[model samples]
Target: KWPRDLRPLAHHDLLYMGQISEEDRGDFNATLRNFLVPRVVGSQKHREVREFIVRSLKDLDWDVEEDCFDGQTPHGIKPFCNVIATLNPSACHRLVLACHYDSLLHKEGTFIGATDSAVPCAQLLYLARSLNGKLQNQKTRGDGLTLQLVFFDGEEAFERWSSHDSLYGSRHLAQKWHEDRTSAERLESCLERSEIANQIDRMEVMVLLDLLGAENPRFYSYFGETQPVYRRLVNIESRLNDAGLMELPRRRRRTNYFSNSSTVGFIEDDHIPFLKRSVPIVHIIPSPFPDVWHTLDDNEQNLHHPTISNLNKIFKAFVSEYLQL
Candidate 1:
């Protein structure tokens, strides 16, 4: 058996599937049958998950604000929101924790989207519970960092083939921020020296999580890989390795250095919007696109606890380090 201390529930578990329990296999399987098998996106189930998130954050005593955006496509308006919750609202330094809560709208039946991104949603809730007040209250971890969890609405393209068709939600948010900050004539000097603009400018870091829970998860240092933030990622990776959370043949292998693959460059995912704004970001994804990339095979049956725990451990460590824990 796996060491009790090294178990999945120690740090992170799929609370969306019910507390990861000894009976978790049954609970998770049932959640998969209900949530993973059916069409959750643009469906009632999707709304349910959204509400569930709202309730979970509220329960954690977060000042939650649901920012809704109506997508004005040629077809029509599709309503969505960037669910945001902030802790220590008065802090000077802030970090945005983000993931797209919306699922893909595919022509072929329902796309459950287990690891294609549900895992990240689950992980966000886990962090909100574990780190929000818990970490901030700690003498060592909470002094300088303020966190905001943003659940983006639309990320996948309407049609799979369009080059400019993806990242609707992030684009919308970034544009709103840009417009809000630039209209000097409207608000004049009041807006120029406002706290909101300062907060937007000082958003120290952004972490985007998507398609991360795979049995063999390998993270690639995508587009802005060589930046200083990449060094922070390497730092987190090393800590997790020392904690025995990351599975690696050697210490160096965890750096995503293997060259024997079709994809060499880092990917362009949800982190692009923040990157455009010069927010040092670490976009995390599993390498070697699972056989189930944008496919029906990407379901809960493929979810693994070890991978989930490893991600949570490394991310928690990174956040702690960023806050000088």
Candidate 2:
């Protein structure tokens, strides 16, 4: 059975499907192509990516914050930051959609890391912009749940992958939020302490997207508890395919975007810290990994536009239904 909180709204509305259009898909690809350059942590391009994300969200009127922190990496301690953009800041609860913007440090020239995450970041932006008007309308109706888009920095390890070195931004933010929830002093002067407190209490799930934009990339649930949410996404894709909204050929349409079977192992991504804090996670990473992961070939040319379009459509639909927009 589905968790009571995870159930879809009673009405079956498909209006959101039309909102995610071909123009938006083109925009998503454009954004991904813009950031295809190397974005290794602490590099000049990395700083540029950070500024770009903040500026874009500010233009959308989202409440944006840069969580800067000094993180200890394998090489040494370096300054790292996490970009968090919230749609409805006053909502008591939120659904987190996240991706890492930094690419792996390649010794052999530029590594774009398109499927690794560049496309995922672009997809998040597309969802936010496409849903903006509807979200505002819902907020006026006193909906308590908000959508938050997070772009994590330093997800790529400095030297090698290890528990401490990877996922620096998520680790810091999760711990910081956990601390803030318990610190009475931190809540004292805040006007929206009660709302924030309620938000912390009702942070239902964190949906993490990674290794996307490849040709027919497959995804599976990392945790069985979150399978219902994943299945909802799968159902949306099936509906869209049936409705002929996605321009792909009939045989090319995918019926199983989310694997019904469970994976024996879990991926180590930005969701780890929140999972440790007992937050339910719906990880949307491709299984068997992308063919060009961490390679020089993970470039714009390798990205499948239809695949990204389908995922973007499904995401917008699921989020709209989940939030009862």
Candidate 3:
């Protein structure tokens, strides 16, 4: 349905992925468990999910914005909102991290999409929680790229995977952000010259997480330009392993979650709309998606804790180094 053409890492001491503590690990899993409930866009439970996310970020003082809008779906015109939490809304540049929080809607049975999206959502939340203090400090400087977390609504289609149905939030939000802002709004955030044009112009790059939280997951570099940054993730994974952070069974070889090579083909997801705008992206979805891709079985039971935990460490380190925190 869609087509698209989409860094060096310094292993530094101040900005690093230290050993994730027992409490932190518990919190991560607890957060994952709490968000495991289904969140089909516009549903009642979805409201709770949305509020929880909003409140979580607000508690930490992140500038959270909800892109509330309605889009036509195969079923009908449905209301959709994409959640965005930014460390500093006025930052000159932004490092956007994204995932979909809405689960697929099926008339038959409940499908939570633990890997489909639940895990990714939880990971983003955990990253925000873990880095709250550092991000606060970073905000004070207002210097480097700020962290912005986006959770799109209706990423999964209501009836079918088509343009009109899928990616309702991303499609709308991307287009909206691409347009120039009013002077009042512009001054409120960027305080920049007209040359900046739009919010999208200030976006440095986007890192998207989807279909995560499974055992033996594999992610590839989908674009040549983003390969360097992707490899930094690989390096973080290796560094964590060598430091005895990423745990595995006795004598079992460590799984290589990220690949070193870059490729041409890309998956059509929330990142597609931004990609069309020439936004630099790192799509971190498994090539051969999780075994429990789109079924009722994609529940908490299928999530791999060690893999999820390892990924938490990796994400924290990558974001820290990427933001030059």
Candidate 4:
């Protein structure tokens, strides 16, 4: 039997049979390092990173699919591929954990975007691995929310941050997944999952991660509909902190990463496309984004290891509860 609970498990018993660990520093470091290089869309390195993500999940037996397309960029047409990994592909409802795998394109130098989304991508990879066994069990049971990891390509712009230039992959995927005809055809073979009108409609909620892996990254609830889930994430973080399980410093332990206040404002990114289609989203990017926002300094040197580990724990607990795994 697989261990399953909706509450924060680590806080109660650090020795829980299926507790997700934050101590896999080697795995975390190696995964983060793989994404620390420049991976702008259409580059050889970008393709490698996409493959890294695919192989990481597929190795664990998740049903992985790459949505490829030729997106019109500021310069011209550019090919992009979004990696989608489903824990149980035939399940009708899905709880999405997504992040952009593409780093910004700049002629000045190589931009790593450690926090600009590399960390989130690493986080998803780590989450999938940590929970793969229980997730696999969820797959056979066949009645709960399916876990899906979506690594979007071409999230950054080649030039300025315009509606048309930025969010290239998401705009394409959102529309493609929303079209009833296309979604019907793709999902038709999966008899059990075909009840949903379209791919976008089957999403229960998408918890989008971005601008993480930095110290003191604070966030506020972006949407009223997603606040319930946001508070659950906050509660998990709090429980971990109160139990002294969080690796945060003593001074920062009480100062939570999630603010108690409601929506301050919404930041634009990959979630915008899905949100436009009314897909409830838990936007997890920091407000006043880390000091290294888009600079070349957004590299491995700037990431906060403890904060990243803490985030990994909180996200693990949250997803565990979300999927009851």
Candidate 5:
């Protein structure tokens, strides 16, 4: 019999399980390497990264859009651009995968900010590449939910982090989309606008990944409502560990992925604007922050292979199961 709290595994879930292979790992690391260079907003390298994301997604035939705006910050006036790529664009409900792609400006030395968010950004790319066909096939079968991959810009503070300076991209997009939903003249085509309205009304959840690829990284369910989703990930990790897919030892077996209890403080990240718009958020961020956050040492060499690979597998399984792909 299945364990009391465990649900029966679907064929699609099992098929998608163990899909994270050495190739996936290699792809993820390779993309992270490309993004490891400093990508401060409004800089040339930042624009290059944006172009890379657009070109890559277009090559996959996914519907992509760049939300560009000029906003004022304490440091100076700059342009903030957010990239949105979608599979099954007409589906009524959406599962958004999001991360900030910008790194902090370090005057002292080079700051790649790998774990800060570069790994998370690359992981989203990896997910889109790996799951595109499955999602397309599912959509053709009339599945009601779609998958959205969003890369947010201006997440890093220009001068100092505050309500005004941080999350510039997300804040703009959220308010803009909110207005679009209410406006009689929609941003998309007529049929597409109707579909987008349905999407906004029926968004399932936005899974925000941040500060990953660190050694023995532990994620927490920052919000109580999303704990069940967090537990699903924990369950996946435990099963992977049992199958010898994960490299954890028996002595470390008791420790699990989900937080032991609900965390107390609020994390300031890109998910806040969406949350304010009443979107359910499953924040997959390490609570204590990674060791090399905002420092010059946060580079590709410091990222942990096992941790990243394990997360890739778990997230792949979760999205498959969530979408019934």
Candidate 6:
């Protein structure tokens, strides 16, 4: 039988990190090594990895859909894949949780990316299982909120240092959502009296978790310039504090861009795609990588379960409170 209480199952248990058996830790390390070793994004192994994610989500009872798109590298054409899983589609309020599952395609094989994204991807899978019909069902049907887990593909630059060559999948998805929201037919359909009432009554927020799993994971707020979204950030932080899972060392403000001045600029990441469309985004990312960001050193050995577990706890609190389940 399905579990009755999901909060305990989700928050009390560590999925990817913390209090894990040595064998399980070793197994997770193996998975990390495998993801790091192979050039997955533009290679055959990429398809295999994507298949694993699809199968995992399917086992968790999610209605999974793979968003396929044609990807262009300087070498040739390769198909890209983005996996999306949704819970409670009939719900009026929608919340999107996302992370990039694809690793960097470097000239010298692949960068393991234990923290760059793989860890968060694993955590999301665990979340899918924990939240499946458990929390949403707590509320009345169609009154509960829907959550979409989007695993984006192609988040790295073609060249080592070119800004123009990165974030293909998220950029595409963001553009698509923006277009849909602007279209007359879509707007009319989604903004009908009932839909408008629902938006004003129940629509929630979108969150993006990135670059976690290190020993010391510090997350900074995305500057006060984006104050409207900061309200959501504070609410999430409050929930995390109440849950005793706030791992971010400094909850202080930080610049959106790298500048000594107060006039902070926008950040370049997957969240930017949604932010441009006025989709209030909370970018939960860690700064100052452990010298292994795009290097081959971001292997499983660097991951810490306590960090992932803490993140999971905080995420659960936010979801539960936001959905009021």
Clashing pairs in 5: none
Q: How many Å off is the CA of 184 in candidate 4?
A: 11
lDDT of 1 by residue, 1-325 (tens): 1001111322232222112334533433333343353433366777777777788788877778777767754335667667777765555455677887777775787777887678777777776665565455642343444677888876777665343567777877776665555322332122124344533554556778888677776665564433455455665565455444454546545533212233456676777876777666766676767777777777777777655655665666556555443
Q: What tens digits encode model 3's per-residue C-alpha lDDT throughout 213-294? A: 9898888898776766777788888877776667787664675888776556668999989999888899989988887889
Tell me each candidate's RMSD, in Å, in order: 8.3, 3.7, 4.3, 4.2, 4.6, 7.6
TM-score (all chains, Cα) for each model:
0.74, 0.89, 0.91, 0.90, 0.89, 0.72
Q: For candidate 3, what is the lDDT? A: 0.81
Worst 10 residues of 6 by lDDT: 1-10
Order by TM-score, highest first: 3, 4, 2, 5, 1, 6
lDDT of 5 by residue, 1-325 (tens): 1111335457456546655667876777777777887898888999999999899898888899999999999877999899999876766567789999988888797778888788998888888778778876876765456788899999988777899989999999888766665321433222233324523444557899999988777777787766666677877777666665665545445336665576677888998998987777999888688878877888888888777877887888778777777
lDDT of candidate 2 over 107-207, digit per residue (tens): 78789998878888888887877778887777665545678888998898877789877998888888788776442233222223333442244456799
Clashing pairs in 6: 17-305, 18-305, 36-112
Give me the runs in candidate 2 sitting further than 4 Å from their true place: 1-20, 182-200, 249-253
Clashes of each: 1, 0, 2, 0, 0, 3
Better of 3 and 5 by lDDT: 3
TM-score of 4: 0.90
Model 2 global lDDT (CA atoms, 0 to 1): 0.77
Give the lowest summed-lDDT range of ten residues in model 2: 183-192
**CA shift of 294, model 2, Å:** 0.4
Backbone-clash count (model 3): 2
